[PDB]
Each structure stands twice: as structure tokens, then as C-alpha cells.
Amino acid sequence: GSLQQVTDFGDNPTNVGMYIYVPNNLASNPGIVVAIHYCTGTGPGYYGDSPYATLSEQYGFIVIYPSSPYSGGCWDVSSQATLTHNGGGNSNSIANMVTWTISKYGADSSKVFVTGSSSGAMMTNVMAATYPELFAAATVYSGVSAGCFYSNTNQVDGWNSTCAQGDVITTPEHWASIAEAMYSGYSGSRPRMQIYHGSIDTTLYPQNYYETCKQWAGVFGYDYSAPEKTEANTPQTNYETTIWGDSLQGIFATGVGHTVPIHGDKDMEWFGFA
Amino acid sequence: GSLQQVTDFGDNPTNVGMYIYVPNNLASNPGIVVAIHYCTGTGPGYYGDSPYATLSEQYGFIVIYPSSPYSGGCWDVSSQATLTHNGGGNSNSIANMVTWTISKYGADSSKVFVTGSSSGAMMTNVMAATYPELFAAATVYSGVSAGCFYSNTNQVDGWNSTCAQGDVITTPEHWASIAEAMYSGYSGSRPRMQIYHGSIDTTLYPQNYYETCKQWAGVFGYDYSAPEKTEANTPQTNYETTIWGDSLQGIFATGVGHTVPIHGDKDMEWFGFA
Numbered sequence: 001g002s003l004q005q006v007t008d009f010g011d012n013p014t015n016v017g018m019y020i021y022v023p024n025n026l027a028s029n030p031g032i033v034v035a036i037h038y039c040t041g042t043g044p045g046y047y048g049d050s051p052y053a054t055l056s057e058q059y060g061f062i063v064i065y066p067s068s069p070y071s072g073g074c075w076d077v078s079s080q081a082t083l084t085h086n087g088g089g090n091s092n093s094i095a096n097m098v099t100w101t102i103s104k105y106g107a108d109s110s111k112v113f114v115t116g117s118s119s120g121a122m123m124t125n126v127m128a129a130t131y132p133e134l135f136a137a138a139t140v141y142s143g144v145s146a147g148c149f150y151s152n153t154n155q156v157d158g159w160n161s162t163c164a165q166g167d168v169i170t171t172p173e174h175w176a177s178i179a180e181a182m183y184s185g186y187s188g189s190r191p192r193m194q195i196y197h198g199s200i201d202t203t204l205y206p207q208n209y210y211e212t213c214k215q216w217a218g219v220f221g222y223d224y225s226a227p228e229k230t231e232a233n234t235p236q237t238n239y240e241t242t243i244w245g246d247s248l249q250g251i252f253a254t255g256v257g258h259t260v261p262i263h264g265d266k267d268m269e270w271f272g273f274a
Numbered sequence: 275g276s277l278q279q280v281t282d283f284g285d286n287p288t289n290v291g292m293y294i295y296v297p298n299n300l301a302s303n304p305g306i307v308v309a310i311h312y313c314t315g316t317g318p319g320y321y322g323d324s325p326y327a328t329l330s331e332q333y334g335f336i337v338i339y340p341s342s343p344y345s346g347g348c349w350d351v352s353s354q355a356t357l358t359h360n361g362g363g364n365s366n367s368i369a370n371m372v373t374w375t376i377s378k379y380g381a382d383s384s385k386v387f388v389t390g391s392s393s394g395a396m397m398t399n400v401m402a403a404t405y406p407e408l409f410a411a412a413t414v415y416s417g418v419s420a421g422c423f424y425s426n427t428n429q430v431d432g433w434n435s436t437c438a439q440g441d442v443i444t445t446p447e448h449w450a451s452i453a454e455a456m457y458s459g460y461s462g463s464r465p466r467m468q469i470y471h472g473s474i475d476t477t478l479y480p481q482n483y484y485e486t487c488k489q490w491a492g493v494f495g496y497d498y499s500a501p502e503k504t505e506a507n508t509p510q511t512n513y514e515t516t517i518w519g520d521s522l523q524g525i526f527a528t529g530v531g532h533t534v535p536i537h538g539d540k541d542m543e544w545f546g547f548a
């Protein structure tokens with residue numbers, strides 16, 4: 001099919017770009033995958049460097065690639081605007097790309113997923129907390145927990161070094177409260193979360209794996225210290241999968257740095273296309 | 275602050291009409307109320323005969339008034355098309371009105387509600403079952419359970435006398451199966467259901483109230499025989515409210531026939547605007 005830029009998709013004061021890949025083999029009622037790029041990247045760049053456009057020709061979903069407006073290409077995952085439901089930041093623009101696409105293509109709103117890598121993984125967690133209503137499931141490749149990049153001076157697209165270096169450590173309860181405040185009083189459904197992180201990540205250090213799993217455990221009321229199951233060498237040698245429940249699993253990749261390589265077929269399974 | 279007809283809102287093979295009321299006091303991130311008319315009526319008729327446009331000026335949400343394409347003005351709540359997620363029937367059309375409005379007005383997709391009287395209350399149950407993903411909550415004014423108007427010959431807009439007379443009686447399990455089958459395999463968010471009916475209804479017999487409460491009890495995993503709470507004279511004298519749980523309450527109006535009059539302020543409370 002083709003990658004098209006869309007410029008009028010709804011309110012977008014932070015000027016995020018929107019690109020979509022509409023497959024040739026478009027399903028009758030297509031799903032949506034939102035695939036969110038890393039720093040120094042762009043939406044078309046992530047299109048070029050991820051399996052989603054290929055998989056969309058198999059499964060017939062539309063892929064949305066949001067594109068950062070900021071110098072350096074990171075996502076704003078620090079401002080109040082981006083860290084609040086309807087706050088008007090980058091995350092709100094991404095939400096609007098979703099709803100534009102659902103209406104324009106008759107996409108199935110119950111089959112909308114979000115995934116990303118590095119900065120886009122940070123944004124994935126933020127999308128899950130700020131627009132939980134939009135997403136059935138999410139897959140995070142090497143990010144930080146929602147609100148870990150909080151700026152204590154309301155900076156937009158600010159890098160939080162304390163968080164990245166793994167110095168921010170707290171309880172499931174505290175992280176859950178932080179995620180909950182991104183949509184205060186929301187009690188509806190939330191996407192099922194899958195969190196990947198590598199053990200030799202020297203950009204977003206591995207403590208962030210545990211902080212993120214703590215967060216979603218706290219959000220879904222799972223006992224962080226008592227997972228349901230742990231699967232060795234799953235999905236492959238030196239990856240370990242911890243399942244806390246239907247709405248949370250973490251995959252820790254020993255010997256892997258920034259970022260954990262996208263596992264496209266595994267994504268299709270978690271989302272439910274496969 | 276006007277009622278507008280909308281003509282190109284997405285796939286609409288059964289040619290349902292779409293009318294919307296956009297209030298003057300429109301909220302920044304408006305909710306949506308879908309208000310579904312009775313037999314012999316139309317969307318604009320229900321606009322003229324319900325409190326929702328008046329209330330939209332208080333609470334700032336948009337109202338969508340679908341309009342039956344059929345002679346006699348009843349809704350198709352009988353065909354396989356209308357009784358299946360993405361089946362292409364009237365229900366599918368109403369779904370598309372929702373998604374069009376979300377995108378066009380930047381409406382909040384977590385704040386979308388559906389309600390209706392008589393034929394429109396039947397369609398309300400159908401919408402909850404066929405497009406559960408769209409709706410946070412629903413209020414049913416004197417309808418029949420989803421799939422009670424099933425046509426054994428796949429008739430479109432067929433009246434089922436056995437159902438209307440109150441002669442279709444089955445279990446929570448069986449009604450829940452009927453509802454589940456309208457979107458098979460779905461296990462996400464569904465609207466919180468509020469069901470009104472009058473004890474002396476001789477159009478849609480009051481057995482249908484109990485069949486509907488059974489249906490939603492089965493769907494949500496509630497014990498139909500053990501509701502959480504009963505409230506005398508609630509919301510008013512001779513009405514009684516039974517709460518089965520967060521996602522189901524029934525309101526039986528003793529001495530009221532077809533239909534139970536709309537309690538607009540109570541709808542606001544159930545929906546969460548108030």
C-alpha cells in the first residue's frame with residue numbers, strides 16, 4: 001500500500017506529524033497499530049525500521065506512525081499537557097490520530113494497539129495512562145514507566161536523567177497512583193501491557209523494567225511480588241517472561257541493550273491478530 | 275445550538291439518518307449521548323421529545339439522534355446484520371455515527387452513552403451487545419433484551435410477538451450467550467447497563483424487564499438471584515431500584531405502562547455528567 005501523511009486529524013497544538021500505512025490487503029473492518037519512534041527518529045523512519053507495515057499486509061490493519069515535532073526527535077513525556085488526559089500535549093495529538101483513522105477507514109475501535117521503542121516506548125506507557133479508553137493492548141520496547149519522565153518544572157520534551165539512570169525507585173502503589181492521576185477518576189478498561197527491557201541497557205537503565213512492571217501491577221491490582229508464572233527462555237534464549245496476569249507481562253532480555261529488538265510476530269500474538 | 279443532519283458519516287448500507295445536536299455551551303472535550311427514538315418516530319422527533327438537548331447545554335456534550343429508515347419507524351433489532359458486530363445493519367450505522375462525531379468534534383471517547391425508548395430501548399440493548407467498545411453506559415427505557423427480537427427467518431425490522439408478549443423466558447446463562455454471540459470472542463469493556471420498565475406495560479410485557487436484567491447479570495458474571503442492593507421509592511415513589519453491581523441496575527416502575535418516562539437528570543447521574 002502506501003505511507004501517507006495526514007495533516008488534518010483534529011486538535012494538534014504541538015504540531016505532531018501523522019503518517020499512516022494503509023495495506024493493499026486492508027481488512028473489511030481493520031484494526032489499528034500505533035507504532036511510535038525513538039529519539040532522532042521520525043514516523044516514516046519507524047515505518048522503515050519496524051515489521052508493522054509487512055505484518056499489516058497479512059492481518060489487514062492500518063499502521064499509524066506519529067512523528068515528533070521536536071528538535072532531537074524525542075517525545076514529550078514530561079509536561080503536564082502530555083501527562084494528562086485531554087491535556088493537549090503530544091499524547092493528545094496521538095489520541096486524535098487514532099480517532100481520525102477509526103472514522104475515515106471504518107477501523108474497528110475494539111482492535112487498536114500501541115507500541116514503540118525507547119522514547120516511543122516511554123510514550124506508549126503514557127498513551128496507556130492518558131487514553132486508556134483507546135487501546136486493547138500495548139507493547140513497550142525499552143521505555144520508562146508512565147510519569148517517570150515527569151518534569152518538576154513542567155518542561156516539554158525534557159529528559160529526566162534521574163529516571164533514565166535508574167535512580168527513581170518506588171512502590172507499585174506510588175507508580176499506580178501516578179498513572180491514575182493521568183486520567184483522574186477513570187475506572188474503565190485499560191490496555192493489556194507487555195513490557196520488554198534489556199539487562200545491559202545503558203540509555204534507560206534496567207531498573208526501569210522493574211519500575212514499569214511495578215506500575216502496571218499496581219494499576220491492575222496484581223501482587224508485584226507474586227507473579228502468576230515465569231517462563232524461562234521465552235520467547236527465546238536468555239529472555240525471561242514473567243506473567244502477573246491477563247493485563248500484565250514483562251519480558252527481560254539478558255545480554256540485550258537499548259533497545260530490545262521488535263518481536264513482530266509476538267506483537268501480533270499479544271494484540272490478538274495472530 | 276442547532277440540530278444538523280449528517281450524511282457522510284461512514285458505511286451506511288441500510289440508510290439510517292443521522293442528526294446531531296451541538297450545544298452552544300459545548301464542552302472543550304465533549305461527551306456524547308446517543309438518543310434512539312421509538313416506533314412511528316424519527317431522530318428529530320426524539321430530539322423534540324426528550325430532555326437531552328436541554329441537558330447538553332448544561333453539560334456540554336453532543337447528542338446523536340439516529341433516524342430509522344423503515345416504514346413504520348421502528349428499528350431493525352431482528353436481522354443477523356443488525357445483531358452482529360460489523361454485520362452492516364442499523365446498529366452498525368449507529369456505531370459509525372459515533373465514531374464520526376468523536377473525530378469531527380474532538381469528543382471524549384471514554385464519555386459516550388446510549389439510551390432509547392421502546393424500539394429505541396430494544397436498539398439500546400442491541401448496541402450494547404454489538405458495539406460494547408463504544409459505550410461507557412447505557413439507559414434502557416422499556417425495551418426487550420438483546421436478541422429477544424431475533425427473527426428466525428432473518429427478517430429486517432421484524433416485530434417478534436412472542437418476545438413482546440413476554441412469552442420468551444430463559445436463563446441468565448442463555449441470554450448472556452445470545453449477547454456474547456453478537457460479538458463472539460470479545461472480552462473488553464462493556465457499558466454499565468441501567469434498565470427501566472413499567473409493571474403495567476401491555477406493549478412490551480414486564481417479563482422483558484426480568485429477561486433483560488438476567489441477560490446483563492449473565493454477561494457481567496453477577497448472580498441474578500443475589501443483587502447487591504434494593505432501594506424503595508428510588509428514583510421516585512413506586513419506582514424500585516435493584517443494583518446487581520457496578521455494571522447493572524434495574525428500575526421497576528409500579529403502575530407505569532409503555533413507556534417509563536425519561537428521567538433526564540437521573541441519566542446524567544448514571545452516565546456521570548452529574
Ligand SMILES: *[C@@H]1O[C@H](CO)[C@@H](O[C@@H]2O[C@H](CO)[C@@H](O)[C@H](O)[C@H]2NC(C)=O)[C@H](O)[C@H]1NC(C)=O
Pocket residue numbers: 147148149150151152153160161162163168169170174175178
Ligand atoms: C524526574 O522524574 C521523577 C519521577 O521519575 C520525579 O520525581 C517526582 O518528584 C516529585 C517532586 O518534584 C515527588 O513528589 C515525587 O514523589 C517523585 N516521583 C517519584 C515516583 O519518585 C522528579 O521530580 C523528576 N525530576 C526532575 C528534575 O524533573
Ligand SMILES: *[C@@H]1O[C@H](CO)[C@@H](O[C@@H]2O[C@H](CO)[C@@H](O)[C@H](O)[C@H]2NC(C)=O)[C@H](O)[C@H]1NC(C)=O
Pocket residue numbers: 421422423424425426427434436437442443444
Ligand atoms: C422470536 O424471538 C425469540 C427470542 O426471543 C426466538 O427464539 C429463539 O428461537 C430459536 C429457534 O429459532 C431457538 O433456538 C432459541 O433458543 C430461541 N431463543 C430463546 C431465547 O428462546 C424466536 O425464534 C423468534 N421468533 C420468530 C418467529 O422469529
Ligand code: NA
Pocket residue numbers: 028029106285360
Ligand atoms: Na465496517
Ligand code: NA
Pocket residue numbers: 046047048049050051052053054063
Ligand atoms: Na513498519
Ligand code: NA
Pocket residue numbers: 109133134135383407408463
Ligand atoms: Na473504547
Ligand code: NA
Pocket residue numbers: 011086302303380
Ligand atoms: Na480536545
